[PDB]
Amino acid sequence: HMSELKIKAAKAAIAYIEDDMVIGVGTGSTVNFFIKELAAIKHKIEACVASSKATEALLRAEGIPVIDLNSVQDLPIYVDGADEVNERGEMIKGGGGALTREKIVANVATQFICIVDESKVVKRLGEFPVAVEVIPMARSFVARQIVKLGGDPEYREGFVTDNGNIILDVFNLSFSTPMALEDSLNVIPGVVENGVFAKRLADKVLVASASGVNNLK
Amino acid sequence: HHMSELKIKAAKAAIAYIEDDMVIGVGTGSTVNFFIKELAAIKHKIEACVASSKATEALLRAEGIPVIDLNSVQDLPIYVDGADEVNERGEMIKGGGGALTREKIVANVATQFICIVDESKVVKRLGEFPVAVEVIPMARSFVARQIVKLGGDPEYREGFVTDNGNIILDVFNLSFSTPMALEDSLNVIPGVVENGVFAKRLADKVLVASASGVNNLK
Numbered sequence: 001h002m003s004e005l006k007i008k009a010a011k012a013a014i015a016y017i018e019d020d021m022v023i024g025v026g027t028g029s030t031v032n033f034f035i036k037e038l039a040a041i042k043h044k045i046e047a048c049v050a051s052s053k054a055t056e057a058l059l060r061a062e063g064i065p066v067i068d069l070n071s072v073q074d075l076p077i078y079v080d081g082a083d084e085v086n087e088r089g090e091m092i093k094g095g096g097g098a099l100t101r102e103k104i105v106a107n108v109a110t111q112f113i114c115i116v117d118e119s120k121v122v123k124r125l126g127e128f129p130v131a132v133e134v135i136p137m138a139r140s141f142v143a144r145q146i147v148k149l150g151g152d153p154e155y156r157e158g159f160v161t162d163n164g165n166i167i168l169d170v171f172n173l174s175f176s177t178p179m180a181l182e183d184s185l186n187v188i189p190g191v192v193e194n195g196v197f198a199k200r201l202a203d204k205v206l207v208a209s210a211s212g213v214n215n216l217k
Numbered sequence: 218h219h220m221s222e223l224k225i226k227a228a229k230a231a232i233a234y235i236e237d238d239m240v241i242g243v244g245t246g247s248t249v250n251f252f253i254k255e256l257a258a259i260k261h262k263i264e265a266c267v268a269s270s271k272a273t274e275a276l277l278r279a280e281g282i283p284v285i286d287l288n289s290v291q292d293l294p295i296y297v298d299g300a301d302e303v304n305e306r307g308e309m310i311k312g313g314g315g316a317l318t319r320e321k322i323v324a325n326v327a328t329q330f331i332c333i334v335d336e337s338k339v340v341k342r343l344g345e346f347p348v349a350v351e352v353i354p355m356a357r358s359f360v361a362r363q364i365v366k367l368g369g370d371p372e373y374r375e376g377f378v379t380d381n382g383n384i385i386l387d388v389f390n391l392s393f394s395t396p397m398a399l400e401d402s403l404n405v406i407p408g409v410v411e412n413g414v415f416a417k418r419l420a421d422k423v424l425v426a427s428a429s430g431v432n433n434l435k
């Protein structure tokens with residue numbers, strides 16, 4: 001029961017929330033269970049920073065106060081999921097299309113806690129595609145540049161990010177040097193951000209399985 | 218000699234490179250706007266234009282010049298645009314007008330980048346004019362902190378929103394000793410969309426208007 005696993009991972013992250021903290025909140029189904037857990041201790045936290053408009057709506061619907069990242073000097077914790085994560089804390093993210101604000105909030109946060117069920121853990125990144133956020137008028141050009149990097153880009157038809165851009169989901173990229181790959185995507189004109197998380201690692205990786213939650217990192 | 222007269226000379230110099238049935242990439246700004254009026258005179262000989270800004274699109278369309286989306290173009294032989302600074306190498310600082318992101322995209326699809334300037338845009342060394350950096354709005358504070366670590370002084374361009382919905386940090390005092398590495402260092406910052414350093418995509422020709430005429434600096 002994957003939902004039961006995701007709930008266990010979510011509950012394990014709650015043990016890191018200290019009184020009066022501002023908490024950064026990711027996106028996706030595992031994070032959404034965490035939001036319900038956060039709701040039960042919302043009297044203990046100052047506020048949350050949301051990594052997507054969807055996440056903001058869910059927090060507000062719970063009566064969890066939300067503040068703008070530009071107003072936050074100190075963000076001690078960011079809790080988020082991942083599409084793939086390894087023992088090093090490298091991740092592929094962006095399955096849900098929110099990877100740009102995810103990476104921004106993750107970079108302000110001191111501690112990045114990654115919560116996953118067992119199926120997200122991999123020994124080698126790469127089977128899950130890399131979502132690349134792209135200025136819409138640059139889509140064709142960026143696709144061509146990503147092909148030169150050995151990727152196979154697939155336009156996520158109909159989808160528009162929180163930032164008004166499109167997503168190319170990129171298959172078959174090599175992850176031999178993940179930080180160089182992340183950089184090579186981002187320097188392409190028109191690329192806003194990409195789902196390789198190799199320069200900003202998860203600090204903790206909480207992995208929920210039938211036997212409990214294990215700190216992979 | 219008006220500044221306007223100089224920009225017009227540069228605009229007319231660029232028209233000499235336009236061939237029948239081309240798709241033409243078009244930049245932004247007051248010098249390019251004189252080029253748009255030169256293009257209107259030959260619009261029948263043009264296939265269409267690619268516009269680097271919504272303002273440029275509106276000016277092209279008001280001249281009856283056909284506009285097409287960049288995603289429908291693969292063969293873009295020319296891109297004509299100005300610069301805030303340009304040197305003899307064809308390196309440029311761009312983005313004073315806030316449209317540097319679409320400017321760089323179109324310039325990168327185009328085969329030949331023709332830079333048209335009056336003589337006041339030419340510098341021996343880039344750097345006095347600030348570098349516009351386009352930033353995801355909720356990342357403004359973070360990006361500013363990261364730029365300060367790179368040795369820059371970022372100033373938020375109050376009230377301004379780019380064509381893409383983002384804000385501009387105009388950055389002073391960056392070092393240009395390694396301008397390509399500078400351009401990259403800004404862009405790998407999470408939340409930075411693009412920046413006005415044009416060091417990896419050079420101008421292929423630099424047409425400089427002065428009282429004496431137009432000189433191909435490059």
Ligand code: NA
Nearest residue numbers: 186187188191
């Ligand atoms: Na880019």
Ligand code: NA
Nearest residue numbers: 404405406409
């Ligand atoms: Na970036």
